Each structure stands twice: as structure tokens, then as C-alpha cells.
Design a protein around this ligand. Structure first.
Ligand SMILES: [Mg+2]
Ligand SMILES: [Mg+2]
Ligand SMILES: [Mg+2]
Ligand SMILES: [Mg+2]
Ligand SMILES: [Mg+2]
Ligand SMILES: [Mg+2]
Ligand SMILES: [Mg+2]
Ligand SMILES: [Mg+2]
Ligand SMILES: [Mg+2]
Ligand SMILES: [Mg+2]
Ligand SMILES: [Mg+2]
Ligand SMILES: [Mg+2]
Ligand SMILES: [Mg+2]
Ligand SMILES: [Mg+2]
Ligand SMILES: [Mg+2]
Ligand SMILES: [Mg+2]
Ligand SMILES: [Mg+2]
Ligand SMILES: [Mg+2]
Ligand SMILES: [Mg+2]
Ligand SMILES: [Mg+2]
Ligand SMILES: [Mg+2]
Ligand SMILES: [Mg+2]
Ligand SMILES: [Mg+2]
Ligand SMILES: [Mg+2]
Ligand SMILES: [Mg+2]
Ligand SMILES: [Mg+2]
Ligand SMILES: [Mg+2]
Ligand SMILES: [Mg+2]
Ligand SMILES: [Mg+2]
Ligand SMILES: [Mg+2]
Ligand SMILES: [Mg+2]
Ligand SMILES: [Mg+2]
Ligand SMILES: [Mg+2]
Ligand SMILES: [Mg+2]
Ligand SMILES: [Mg+2]
Ligand SMILES: [Mg+2]
Lengths: 59, 90, 95, 42, 58
RNA sequence: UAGGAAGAGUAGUACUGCCCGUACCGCAAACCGACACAGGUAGAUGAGGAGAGAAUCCUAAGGUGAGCGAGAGAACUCUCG
RNA sequence: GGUAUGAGUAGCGAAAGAAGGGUGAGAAUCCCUUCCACCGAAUAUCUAAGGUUUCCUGAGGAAGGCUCGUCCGCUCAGGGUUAGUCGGGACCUAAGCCGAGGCCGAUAGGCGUAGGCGAUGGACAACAGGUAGAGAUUCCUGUACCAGUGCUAAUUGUUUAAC
RNA sequence: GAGCUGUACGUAAGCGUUGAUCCAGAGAUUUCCGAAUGGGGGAACCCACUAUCUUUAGUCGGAUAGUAUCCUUACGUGAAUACAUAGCGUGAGGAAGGCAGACCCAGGGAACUGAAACAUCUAAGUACCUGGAGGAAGAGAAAGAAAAAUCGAUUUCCUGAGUAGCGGCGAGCGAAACGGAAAGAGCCCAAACCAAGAAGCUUGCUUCUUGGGGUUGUAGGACACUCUAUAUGGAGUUACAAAAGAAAGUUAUAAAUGAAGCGGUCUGGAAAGGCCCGCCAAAGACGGUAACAGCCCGGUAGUUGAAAUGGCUUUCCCUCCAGAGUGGAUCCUGAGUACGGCGGAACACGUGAAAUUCCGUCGGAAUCCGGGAGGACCAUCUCCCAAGGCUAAAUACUCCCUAGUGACCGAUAGUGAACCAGUACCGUGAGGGAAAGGUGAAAAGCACCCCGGAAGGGGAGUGAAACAGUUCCUGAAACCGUGUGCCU
């Protein structure tokens, strides 16, 4: 959270993209039954949320 | 965004039986048009989409001891990639 | 609760009164506490994934916290508990 | 030939939400059913 | 349907028989459609004969 | 025709074409009749022989043997000769 | 609300079954075979309404099924519905409904013009094969059509008027 | 401040003293429907246009914002028609809808019923509909009450009084003032007149706009005269003008600390109980804990506490402000009003002898020497000054919140609803509307064996108990059985 606030808006935007891609691949693996660490999903969801929050605080 | 439009792949005896016919079955957003799906799949998998067939599944009624209710309505897309395109994995 | 996991307690009521032990788990929602070698029950366990041979297992069952007093590691006696603020974090004190 | 000859459209056109909202007395019905806490208005 | 000047309009009361049976009725204003200037602009409005008496201009 | 006007058509070539419905029952055990109810339910198709015929009888394609049975073969009742 | 009595009584809702084989803890009642019998302007095949998962597969047999039940429209899991051309909407209007302003009216509102909405009608381009546990003019193969879009090429206009 | 990932009698993957879960304040996000407002629509759906990006070779796609109607208002344009005006366009504000079935005000307004019938009357201005709505509303600073030789706005309570009265003088309806209390608070306009404009020809006079002035009874004001103030003082957003801010204090919204028995014995499955000893108490509230606890736990009395948000109270800032006396020459002091007739209604008062108040209709004053009331009316006297407005408190109610209370209920009761209830179910719909609480202290929820396909059972075991075995405290009666002492 404090680490996110360090980054620029554009850099956060790119951090989101990565997390969105990560979340997508987790959901993919999960559906194909190839995901063990299913707790990863919630973390990534929360992370995305956190990043959007900081960006909206910037404005 | 495109990964909000494609939810997850559909892995069934039917959906797996057409992975050789270059036809990939996805659960997509219930508001997503088949055009939105065609561009979503092209942005995520770097494939060239020939056609997208789509069907709406209404929720199925399920009881669990006195308490009855409906499973979620689904939108299922079957994306046929061209003969020269790369293949999606599953 | 006046005791947490890892504390040595005395049991003051029940069939195991006078017996002391090390709090193994705490269930603060139920005001219950698991003490090593206290309130031993016989669980008639079918064979499954865990305990694959099955058997009648002798294991510990939780005691209500109000039935344990904290052992003052100084005098080795049961005590009531106070709370004193020592610079940074508050710490339990005996009587 | 029995009294209830069903029709999806006739049901909604006579008794449906928009028809209830289209008149003061229909809105009274919705208000009444809300006050009683019906799961189903219209 | 009311006098635009004075607000006169229908009010209710009783008709009464010689025997004092009562039944509801109205008293209507003596409203007349006339062209007067409301907000400068002259238009046709209901005005009571009472309001037109002496004062006011058509 | 009034209007608007530098792009128009012709040929070839390769691309593009959204949303909703689509299962199943549907003269029915899934619809309307509280019922797996002798009732009701619009339309398209609806073969042959004899026949005017979509009548009738027997059949074709196709569908079905109908969600209690085994005996008995009295009175009586019903449906029949 | 419970439980009697009537009583092991009425009833078990139009109809042709039989044997053999199988399955199974168990079979008049499930599966297969053969013969027999019934409908056949229907008791067949489609389609609309209506229903809304009842469809398919596997498992089950408490309850439901007027008996039985290994079976099921029942219970439990998983599945299953693919369209530029089929039907509806991004087209059209009828009855009717609504209705800016407007007219009328204790209030509420009633009426109604422009304008809308509204099929049971009008317009509108795809066929034959294949395939199958569950969709098919929708998927696949072949061969088309309708409406667009660019891209190449000539052709002809590029302010007196092609279009 | 150590556990946590809701229920609920699951598996999995995880998080946490680098402070999680949890609690409180603030913020962010907040799909679609709904007044629903871009158009449409069978609510939760469909389909756009205008900008501005964005994607593609281009169609085809994507993102963001705007786009309802009316009212008021400004600015533009603008017909018949010449100026205009209607109309049209754009920009500002505002409305819309909901509901606490309460309370309040207003429009409209029954019937059953009572009268032992019934019509006047009653029920009842009730129910209900509709509108306005506010935290309250309504009323309110005398054209009042009275009849001392006096009260001083309104409201509510006690009382007057079931009186005076009204009434097919039937049934019934039924005041008020005085007296006693709660609470108290008073004010601003219109007009003379003054000043400054605009608009008009009334052509130097009238009619509108803004400001000053001014508010009341044998009078007050204007107007003349004089005396002091021109913020010295005073007042204020609750009326009396209206926006603004600060600070400190306090309250609410999380919490913190918090005395004293593991006392000894008895019974017991378990002790908080018995017996015997102590102790704390500004704490002997309540709850829990294996039976009944001031000393076991959460707590309780007492004492501390708030980063944040909101409320209240002071203080400051800020804003705003003229008051006495003396003269009644002249001027002003609410007009289609007050009153009156006719028809109704409200007044306790049913048209009566009917004052008083309001509505419709018609007629219609005086206007300071003037006017109104004192229950027809006149005269005298007394009290008052309408036809303009505002105004807190005492009062009404409770969808809510916080803390509590009950000679209130305890599962057929109490809410319809202790339980996923306005559910299931019934009905086309409005609408109607249930049943259903208890294992144990703890799941220790019956390993294993046996009959059985299972269900179910018998052992074994857990437990104080299983005749507590996942709808499981107790377990009455009807009713159904088995056995047998006496009879048939
Ligand atoms: Mg489709
Ligand atoms: Mg029905
Ligand atoms: Mg079909
Ligand atoms: Mg039938
Ligand atoms: Mg017929
Ligand atoms: Mg045949
Ligand atoms: Mg008999
Ligand atoms: Mg018999
Ligand atoms: Mg019989
Ligand atoms: Mg039968
Ligand atoms: Mg025939
Ligand atoms: Mg089936
Ligand atoms: Mg049976
Ligand atoms: Mg079966
Ligand atoms: Mg095709
Ligand atoms: Mg028409
Ligand atoms: Mg029309
Ligand atoms: Mg249409
Ligand atoms: Mg089929
Ligand atoms: Mg809209
Ligand atoms: Mg009577
Ligand atoms: Mg203590
Ligand atoms: Mg003992
Ligand atoms: Mg007990
Ligand atoms: Mg107790
Ligand atoms: Mg008078
Ligand atoms: Mg009169
Ligand atoms: Mg009266
Ligand atoms: Mg008088
Ligand atoms: Mg009059
Ligand atoms: Mg008198
Ligand atoms: Mg009197
Ligand atoms: Mg006066
Ligand atoms: Mg009850
Ligand atoms: Mg009971
Ligand atoms: Mg019991």
C-alpha cells in the first residue's frame, strides 16, 4: 500500500495490467483444475482493488 | 477490458471433444456481444478468430434442504480459430 | 480472555481439578481452551484420509476458560491477572 | 374449458409492474404490497 | 377552473328539502372567460363576475 | 423534381455482419382442469384396398399394449348377443 | 392438534398379452428377443401457445408412482440449446393504448393534437448432404444468396453540373 | 493484542506480534431496475444520437461525457402582421417520487348503527379518498374577555359542568368566561410624508419602481418645533434583517483500568450447594462457568480515555441599529372591503328572538365630527380599532436510536412471524396467509463385531444418563398391542 503510493500513476496502471493478466491465468488454471494455491486469487483481486484505490485518491 | 469479457474456459466431455476442431469454449460476461468476444480472445491468446457462436444458459433450479434457488445464468462462447492461427492450450 | 496459547494454567473446577498444563489452543468465540492432558475424551474414529486404520483415539477436549487460572512462573501458584503498561505494550501482572 | 387460460403477455399487461406504475391506484397497490413486505410485487 | 384574481371556485354544502333532508351540492363561482393581461401578455382566463365588478380591465 | 454534389459506379479480390429465442413436452403423465384426472387445447402434413369421401372396415409408415394382478364363472347391477 | 370407528371394507381412473433369455438381495410390473394385439384424418409427423430443465449420462430406491419396482416426468451429481439468411428486435403500420403543448374538471384526474408504442397482418437474403448421449436450415463438408467494407485495376466525372 | 478466513454438527489453500481477524470515525468504489429523466419497454430489458478519444486496411467493435418534461428567470432568434407578440432555441435555478396506516392542516366525505320502526336528528365531519406537509402543525399579540369600578396575545391541563343551553324539547348533543396551573415574547408592514429616478404628456403634473419614514385609540403617526444619541451603547440568524466563520468547553459515536477464596471438608458426573473457616465492598448489577458464586470469567462501583466526524453551550469575530418630549390647522391610518338580501355551513346553539364566524351569489358603507363589539334591535355607557404579515415555549404523536422498567407472555401464549415469514401455500388479481423451539457440560455424535441389499437392530464402547442416539429435556390422555389372576 505504502509501496504502491511510491509509484507514478502510469506505473500503477501498468502494475494493474500485470495483475489483471495474473488473475486471468489463475482463473484459467482453476477451471482446468491445474491450480493448487487457490489463495493466490483473492490476494490478486485485493491487489488490483488496492491499486485502483490509490489512483482514485490521486484525483 | 478483455479479461473481464472472457471469464474462464469450459472443460467438459463436449468442450474437450472439439479442441481438435480448433473450437474453444469459454464462459464470457452475460452482457458481452460475440464481436466483443472475437476481439477479447484475439487480445488474450494472440489467435486469429474465424467465427464466434454464443448461447445464453438460464440458471438451473437447485434445492439444498428446504432452501431452493437458481444457479447463475451463463453466456457460453465457442470460438473457432482459423486454420493458420496458433492453438489455445487448456 | 485471561489466558492464551502457550500459557501454563491450573485447572480449578471439574474432574481434572489440581492438574496443570500448557494451553495448546484457545477458542475465544466459545470462551473455551484446550489444555495438554486435560479433559481427555475417547473419539470413536472411522478409518478415513487422516488416521487411515481408524481406532478409539484418546485426545484432549476443550475446558471453559473460567475453569483455569494462570500459573505465575515466579511462585508456581495460581493467580488472578492485572494489566500494567510497560513503555511500549501492556503486559499481564500477578497478585 | 377452465377459467385460467394463460398468456405471458396478458399476465404482464394486466398485472405487471409497469401497468401498476401507470396509475395512482396501481401505485397504491405497490405501496401496499411493499408495506406488507411481499417478496413479489406485480 | 377558478377565478385567477380572487381564487373563487366550487365549494360544497347541502341542498335541503322542506323536511330538512340534506343532500350534497356545490356552489360554483360566477366565472367568466375573459382576455386580461396576466403578466403583461393578455390571454383568456377564468375571472369571477365579482372580480370584474368595477375594477380590472378586459 | 426541390435540394446536395467530387467523387461515383463496373470488374476482380479478401474481409465484415449485433441482440433475443433455439434443450424437452406439446391433442399431453410435462399445457388448462387441486391428481401420472375418460374433459378442454389454434395451425401444417395426414399413405393403400374397396369407396364420392378425411365416411366405413382392414392395413402402410410410424406409434402403442395405457402403473395393480391371479382365480372364479353365484345372486345382483351395468354394457352387450 | 392427535387418534379412533366404518375396515382390511369402497376404490386402485376406459384398453391384450405371452413365453423365453437377462439383470438383480429381490422381478406379473426393468432390459432384450420372438410371437400376438391396438391406433392409423391418428393413438402418426411437425409447429404455435403454455410449461420452464421435465431433456442427456451416471448413480439411487427413503418419500412420490393408487400394486410392484432393479424402473421413472421422482432423488443426487455432472452435462446439454451454436444462426447475416429460421422466428422476434436494430423495419412497417391495424384495433387499442399512451400522449409535449392543449381543452375540461372540488382534489385525484378525464379527454385529446403533434408525436409515439402496439401483430394476429405487410416487408425482408440458404440449400442439400454429413454427424450424434443430449442442438442443428444454427455445428461440419459442399454449393449459394443479401447487405456492407476496404484493397488493386482500368473507366468516366473532378462548378455548369457524372452521381 | 492472538488468533483468523460469517452461519451450520465440510474439504482445500492460506493470512497473522513487520499487529491479522475484530470494534468505532472519515473516505473510495457503489452493476441494473425503480420518480428514472436520451427514445422505447411486458421493472431489472431493447435501441440510439452528439461530441471527444480508441481499435481495424476498413466496415464491424471499445471508452468517457452530454442529451426527459414542466415552472421561474436571463440572453438570442422570431409568424400570420409593419413595429411587436405568440412560437422556437440556448444558459441558469427549481420541481417531480417516496413515506411513520402515527401526530397536524386543508379539499371531498359515507353507511351500518342509535332513536327499541323511521324521514329531522344520530353515527360523524368518524371511516375512507385527495392535497399540503412540519418536527411538530394549528392558534397567536384584542375592532378580545367583561361589568371589578378590571383584565391584558395564543396554546394545553384542572375546574366551571353533564351546568347554561341545543334537541321529532325525542334519542341524544353539550359550551364558554370567571378561578387555579404549565409556559411565557413580542414584532414587521400598507398609508400620510420625504428623497432620488424611470415612464408619461396629466405638457411641469400625475401614475408605477427602489430607498428613507412609519405603525396606533377620547389615539398613533405624518407634519411642524425642540433635546440627546449617528455605535457611547444595543441587538442578532428561533419572529423581531441576513450570510459568515474561528477558538475553548462539553456530550455522543471505539475503549482502558478496576477489590476480595485454586480456603478446608461432605455429597456428587461436575459444587457456585451443605457444614466449618476467612476476606472485599463507592463493587452484594446482570450474565456465564459441568447444580445456586460479591471473592472463577466477562464484568459491576469508582477512576481514566478519542485521531476522526457530528450535536450542543459559552466567548470572540462578523453583520445590523436612532430614541425622548411638545403641539391636533391640515394629511394618513388596509374598499368591491365591512355590512345587507338570498342559499348553505361552522359556532354546544337543528332558523330560532339568533348575536358571532365562514362559503357561493347579488347589492354595497363610513372612512376621524370616523368605525366595531357587549347574543335580535335602539339609546346610553364600557371596552376595542377589522378588512396585511410574522412569531419560540408549555401541547400531539413515534417508523426510529440509547439506557432501562414491568404483582406483562412463555411456544395453541406472546407479534402473523422465538425457527431464513409476509415465507410455504391459496388466488387471474387486489388480496388471504400457516405449520414449525429444547441431544449433551462437552460430540465425548456409537471404533470394532454380528444379522441385513439397505433400513433397522443386538452387542461392544462414550457419557451421570443412550429408555439423552442428529428433530434426540419431560413425555399425560385418546388409540394400538403382548402377557395373564378372576369371569364368560
Ligand atoms: Mg443465438
Ligand atoms: Mg393456477
Ligand atoms: Mg427442438
Ligand atoms: Mg388427460
Ligand atoms: Mg376445438
Ligand atoms: Mg408397423
Ligand atoms: Mg361393510
Ligand atoms: Mg364386499
Ligand atoms: Mg373389489
Ligand atoms: Mg389403470
Ligand atoms: Mg375415421
Ligand atoms: Mg429422461
Ligand atoms: Mg410403492
Ligand atoms: Mg433408475
Ligand atoms: Mg453457414
Ligand atoms: Mg390509431
Ligand atoms: Mg397517430
Ligand atoms: Mg414496433
Ligand atoms: Mg432432439
Ligand atoms: Mg432511460
Ligand atoms: Mg331498534
Ligand atoms: Mg476481579
Ligand atoms: Mg467428589
Ligand atoms: Mg443439572
Ligand atoms: Mg446454571
Ligand atoms: Mg355585526
Ligand atoms: Mg344566512
Ligand atoms: Mg350545526
Ligand atoms: Mg350587533
Ligand atoms: Mg352574502
Ligand atoms: Mg346586550
Ligand atoms: Mg346566550
Ligand atoms: Mg384601525
Ligand atoms: Mg404463535
Ligand atoms: Mg411445550
Ligand atoms: Mg423425547
Amino acid at each position: 500500500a505504502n509501496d504502491i503510493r511510491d509509484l507514478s500513476t502510469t506505473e500503477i496502471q501498468d502494475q494493474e495490467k500485470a495483475l489483471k493478466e495474473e488473475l486471468f491465468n489463475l482463473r484459467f488454471q482453476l477451471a482446468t483444475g491445474q491450480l493448487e494455491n487457490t489463495a493466490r486469487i483473492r490476494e490478486v483481486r485485493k491487489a488490483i482493488a488496492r491499486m485502483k484505490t490509490i489512483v482514485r485518491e490521486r484525483e | 477490458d478483455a479479461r473481464d469479457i472472457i471469464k474462464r474456459p469450459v472443460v467438459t466431455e463436449e468442450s474437450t471433444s472439439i479442441l481438435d476442431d480448433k473450437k474453444y469454449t469459454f464462459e464470457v460476461d452475460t452482457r458481452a456481444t460475440k464481436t466483443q468476444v472475437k476481439y477479447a480472445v484475439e487480445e488474450i491468446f494472440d489467435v486469429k478468430v474465424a467465427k464466434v457462436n454464443v448461447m445464453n444458459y438460464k440458471g438451473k433450479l437447485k434445492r439444498m434442504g428446504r432452501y431452493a434457488g437458481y444457479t447463475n445464468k451463463r453466456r457460453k462462447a465457442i470460438v473457432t480459430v482459423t486454420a493458420d492461427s496458433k492453438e489455445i492450450q487448456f | 480472555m485471561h489466558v492464551k496459547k502457550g500459557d501454563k494454567v491450573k485447572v480449578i473446577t471439574g474432574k481434572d481439578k489440581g492438574k496443570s498444563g500448557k494451553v495448546l489452543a484457545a477458542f475465544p468465540k466459545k470462551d473455551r481452551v484446550l489444555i495438554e492432558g486435560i479433559n481427555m475424551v475417547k473419539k470413536h474414529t472411522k478409518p478415513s484420509n487422516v488416521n487411515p486404520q481408524g481406532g478409539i483415539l484418546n485426545v484432549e477436549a476443550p475446558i471453559h476458560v473460567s475453569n483455569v487460572m494462570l500459573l505465575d512462573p515466579k511462585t508456581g501458584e495460581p493467580t488472578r491477572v492485572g494489566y500494567e503498561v510497560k513503555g511500549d505494550k501492556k503486559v499481564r501482572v500477578a497478585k | 374449458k377452465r377459467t385460467y387460460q394463460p398468456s405471458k403477455r396478458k399476465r404482464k399487461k394486466v398485472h405487471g409492474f409497469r401497468t401498476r406504475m401507470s396509475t395512482k391506484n396501481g401505485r397504491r397497490v405497490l405501496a401496499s404490497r411493499r408495506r406488507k413486505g411481499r417478496k413479489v410485487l406485480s | 377552473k377558478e377565478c385567477v384574481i380572487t381564487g373563487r371556485k366550487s365549494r360544497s354544502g347541502n341542498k335541503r328539502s322542506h323536511a330538512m333532508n340534506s343532500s350534497k351540492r356545490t356552489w360554483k363561482a360566477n366565472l367568466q372567460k375573459v382576455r386580461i393581461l396576466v403578466n403583461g401578455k393578455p390571454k383568456k382566463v377564468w375571472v369571477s363576475a365579482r372580480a370584474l365588478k368595477s375594477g380590472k380591465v378586459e
